[PDB]
Amino acid sequence: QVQLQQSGAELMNPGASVKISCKSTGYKFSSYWIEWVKQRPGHGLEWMGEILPGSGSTNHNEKFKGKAIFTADASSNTAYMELSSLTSEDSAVYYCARTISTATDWFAYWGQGTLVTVSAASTKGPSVFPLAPSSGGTAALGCLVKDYFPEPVTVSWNSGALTSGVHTFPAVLQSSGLYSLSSVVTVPSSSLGTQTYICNVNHKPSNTKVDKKVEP
Amino acid sequence: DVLMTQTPLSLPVSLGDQASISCRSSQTIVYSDGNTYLEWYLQKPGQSPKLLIYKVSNRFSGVPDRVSGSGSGTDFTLKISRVEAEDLGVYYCFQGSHVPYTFGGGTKLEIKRTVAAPSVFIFPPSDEQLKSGTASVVCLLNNFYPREAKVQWKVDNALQSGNSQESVTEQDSKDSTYSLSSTLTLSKADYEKHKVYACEVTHQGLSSPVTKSFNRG
Amino acid sequence: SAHHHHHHGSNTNIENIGDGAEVIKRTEDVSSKKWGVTQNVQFDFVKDKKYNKDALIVKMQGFINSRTSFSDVKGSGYELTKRMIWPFQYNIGLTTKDPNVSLINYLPKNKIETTDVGQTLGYNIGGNFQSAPSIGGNGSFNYSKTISYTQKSYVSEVDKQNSKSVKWGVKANEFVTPDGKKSAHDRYLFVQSPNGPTGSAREYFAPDNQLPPLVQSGFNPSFITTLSHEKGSSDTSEFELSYGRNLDITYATLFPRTGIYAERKHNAFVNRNFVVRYKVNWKTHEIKVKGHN
Amino acid sequence: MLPAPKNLVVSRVTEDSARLSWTAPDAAFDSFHIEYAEPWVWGEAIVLTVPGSERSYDLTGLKPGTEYVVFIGGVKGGHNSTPLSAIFTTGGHHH
Numbered sequence: 001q002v003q004l005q006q007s008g009a010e011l012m013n014p015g016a017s018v019k020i021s022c023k024s025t026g027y028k029f030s031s032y033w034i035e036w037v038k039q040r041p042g043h044g045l046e047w048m049g050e051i052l053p054g055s056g057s058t059n060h061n062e063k064f065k066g067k068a069i070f071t072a073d074a075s076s077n078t079a080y081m082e083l084s085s086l087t088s089e090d091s092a093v094y095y096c097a098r099t100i101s102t103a104t105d106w107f108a109y110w111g112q113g114t115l116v117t118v119s120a121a122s123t124k125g126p127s128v129f130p131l132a133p134s135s136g137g138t139a140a141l142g143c144l145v146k147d148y149f150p151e152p153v154t155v156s157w158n159s160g161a162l163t164s165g166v167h168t169f170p171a172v173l174q175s176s177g178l179y180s181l182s183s184v185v186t187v188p189s190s191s192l193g194t195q196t197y198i199c200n201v202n203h204k205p206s207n208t209k210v211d212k213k214v215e216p
Numbered sequence: 217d218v219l220m221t222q223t224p225l226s227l228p229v230s231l232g233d234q235a236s237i238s239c240r241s242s243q244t245i246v247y248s249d250g251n252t253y254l255e256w257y258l259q260k261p262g263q264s265p266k267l268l269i270y271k272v273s274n275r276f277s278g279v280p281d282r283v284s285g286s287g288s289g290t291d292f293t294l295k296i297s298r299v300e301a302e303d304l305g306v307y308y309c310f311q312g313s314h315v316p317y318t319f320g321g322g323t324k325l326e327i328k329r330t331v332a333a334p335s336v337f338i339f340p341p342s343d344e345q346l347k348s349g350t351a352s353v354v355c356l357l358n359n360f361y362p363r364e365a366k367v368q369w370k371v372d373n374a375l376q377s378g379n380s381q382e383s384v385t386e387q388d389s390k391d392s393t394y395s396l397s398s399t400l401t402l403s404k405a406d407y408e409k410h411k412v413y414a415c416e417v418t419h420q421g422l423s424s425p426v427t428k429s430f431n432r433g
Numbered sequence: 434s435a436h437h438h439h440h441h442g443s444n445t446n447i448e449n450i451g452d453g454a455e456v457i458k459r460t461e462d463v464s465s466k467k468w469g470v471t472q473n474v475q476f477d478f479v480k481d482k483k484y485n486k487d488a489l490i491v492k493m494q495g496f497i498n499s500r501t502s503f504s505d506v507k508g509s510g511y512e513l514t515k516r517m518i519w520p521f522q523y524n525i526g527l528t529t530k531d532p533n534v535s536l537i538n539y540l541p542k543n544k545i546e547t548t549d550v551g552q553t554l555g556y557n558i559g560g561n562f563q564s565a566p567s568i569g570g571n572g573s574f575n576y577s578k579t580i581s582y583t584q585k586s587y588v589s590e591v592d593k594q595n596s597k598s599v600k601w602g603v604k605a606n607e608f609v610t611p612d613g614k615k616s617a618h619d620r621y622l623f624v625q626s627p628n629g630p631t632g633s634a635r636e637y638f639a640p641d642n643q644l645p646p647l648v649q650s651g652f653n654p655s656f657i658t659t660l661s662h663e664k665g666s667s668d669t670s671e672f673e674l675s676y677g678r679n680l681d682i683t684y685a686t687l688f689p690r691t692g693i694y695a696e697r698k699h700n701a702f703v704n705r706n707f708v709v710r711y712k713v714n715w716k717t718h719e720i721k722v723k724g725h726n
Numbered sequence: 727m728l729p730a731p732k733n734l735v736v737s738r739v740t741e742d743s744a745r746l747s748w749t750a751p752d753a754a755f756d757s758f759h760i761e762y763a764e765p766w767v768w769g770e771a772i773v774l775t776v777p778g779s780e781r782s783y784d785l786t787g788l789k790p791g792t793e794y795v796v797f798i799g800g801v802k803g804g805h806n807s808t809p810l811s812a813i814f815t816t817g818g819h820h821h
Binding site (some may be wrong): 044046050061063110129134 | 217257259264265266267270271274276283306308310312315316317318320321322324335336337339340341342344345348350352356358359380381382383384385388397399401412428
């Protein structure tokens with residue numbers, strides 16, 4: 001029910017194309033522009049273009065004039081963007097944003113973001129291995145998500161019941177072309193023999209849902 | 217298609233100080249209707265950009281009082297009264313009065329915490345991982361400041377290089393501390409060939425490089 | 434690529450009428466308690482690559498209060514003289530002073546004297562405007578706009594028109610009285626015996642059910658006129674829209690046992706207009722109000 | 727009805743004052759009835775009676791920047807003429 005709800009993750013081979021969605025609730029588009037923003041992992045925020053849906057009249061930046069196609073469907077409540085000749089440059093996260101001016105107050109909505117990965121070698125499920133704790137007044141424990149492709153993976157502990165002290169590290173790209181990350185959590189040492197800790201790994205591209213128990 | 221030059225690129229600021237970000241346009245941002253459509257966005261790590269101030273000065277719904285934006289013509293400034301650990305991230309200035317729209321170069325805001333010492337741990341590879349044929353040793357550096365810290369692997373007093381990848385989390389929004397995770401990846405055969413596995417951490421917050429190790433078995 | 438102008442968060446509504454042509458629809462609402470006038474004007478722009486001239490379709494509607502009043506004539510001796518003031522003619526006009534702008538059509542084009550009025554303006558790609566005196570026909574044009582207003586007992590006719598201005602007038606015509614028809618110039622129009630020497634000023638004149646809507650309530654205008662602009666040249670131009678009325682007086686002096694005398698003061702209050710000055714931005718396709726009286 | 731005067735002119739309009747003036751025969755009217763109000767707000771009008779020998783009157787105490795209507799009818803022994811009309815607006819900014 002979120003205003004601008006974008007598509008899920010995506011993996012497309014180079015040279016091809018991909019079209020991602022931006023399912024938009026909110027009273028009436030076909031009167032309000034909806035724009036698209038691209039963010040390289042190198043902290044760069046770049047404005048792509050927009051489209052007035054009810055008219056189809058597009059309005060884009062010259063950088064993406066040959067790389068992005070904007071459409072929108074008034075029958076449902078969705079706007080689309082298509083990317084031609086996918087290279088490694090276009091691997092980024094793409095947000096759609098709507099904004100409403102009115103007279104009293106002012107609205108600005110954004111989407112969660114869609115990850116686009118441009119590669120060749122094939123979705124692979126992750127492998128989860130526990131890291132048993134050893135220490136001091138505090139004991140450390142975590143899970144190891146090794147060998148998976150592509151990004152991302154969502155990791156929660158105790159189905160979200162444990163949040164304080166958790167640190168999920170960003171994935172690093174190994175030499176084999178597969179990602180690998182670690183997620184640890186600092187808990188008191190006296191809670192090792194009484195409380196159970198389980199990490200919830202979820203890789204939506206491969207439909208993998210692993211629940212591993214961490215124990216000394 | 218105007219240029220937006222942000223300044224500075226990196227702006228450190230302690231817990232309680234005042235931070236100001238300047239952003240200058242290559243053309244007067246004033247639209248024909250009379251309003252200057254300048255905006256400031258905050259993107260905390262792992263989240264979508266969030267709007268702070270629209271039309272140079274007007275604050276957005278839910279924006280704290282510490283925030284205030286000013287400027288005129290082409291030069292503009294965003295100021296934060298009492299910077300807090302929850303305000304860190306990247307700040308972008310955006311112009312919405314002339315198509316095509318453009319963003320700023322981004323401004324990274326980091327905190328200046330009272331220097332801390334890294335809490336070092338080490339985890340042997342799980343036996344389930346050994347059944348696949350690969351052994352992985354993890355060295356954890358939890359909660360430390362600043363971000364600079366060197367980690368070196370030693371297998372039987374033999375320096376390792378080209379077989380370890382480290383990952384660092386973003387600066388936490390409470391204690392303003394980072395976390396490091398070094399992952400040493402060997403094979404099953406090479407792991408059984410040795411006994412001493414150590415990871416040495418050299419940080420300015422430690423009197424001497426502290427070493428945490430374990431023996432296989 | 435970047436050629437559809439606006440500001441961040443604008444509410445830009447466009448109708449794509451096919452090919453490389455579209456219609457940008459804008460509206461403005463101005464009221465005035467001094468003059469009793471509301472201008473509900475629609476500004477439909479015509480973007481067309483096959484057309485070498487900018488086009489703006491102005492549909493002027495709203496409401497103009499009749500300003501009708503029944504009063505006593507204060508003073509000694511005038512205790513039996515009552516005064517009615519009613520609108521004789523409504524005024525709608527659109528004038529401009531930009532040399533690069535010229536009017537290309539206007540509806541109604543010719544004087545029409547029926548109770549109801551319904552006419553249509555159509556547009557085909559290429560700068561082709563033609564107007565049909567009905568709202569009949571089905572999909573001959575890419576975009577069509579109609580006018581609709583009732584003018585019971587009145588007559589709509591053009592008073593002034595040229596390349597920079599157009600002015601209408603809804604003058605009074607013929608009324609239905611209980612004793613036949615009466616013309617708009619009959620000095621004894623709307624007057625009647627008040628049934629004694631104590632009745633109200635209101636009783637010296639016809640009831641509300643014998644008065645047409647344009648005399649009791651007012652007039653709901655509905656006029657269209659299109660202006661063309663040479664591409665390039667001027668970026669901005671101004672024009673003024675006048676909504677008004679002309680008021681007549683009808684005194685009814687009562688004499689006992691004899692009769693009721695009447696006389697009309699025609700065109701006592703003229704040009705009772707509410708003028709609003711608008712400005713067009715042919716680059717951003719936007720309207721803004723500069724001022725009013 | 728008896729015949730009425732003519733040439734009703736409004737002169738010397740200030741922010742709060744104005745002068746009326748009219749033409750009537752040398753000895754045709756006993757008194758004049760001046761009636762004036764804010765446009766189409768009856769019940770806010772007031773009537774003034776000047777001797778039928780005067781040909782002008784100065785209105786005083788007017789709201790600045792406001793439009794006003796005028797009605798003047800000559801009288802000569804009960805039977806009276808027909809009011810002459812005038813409209814003017816005082817100076818200033820109405821608010």
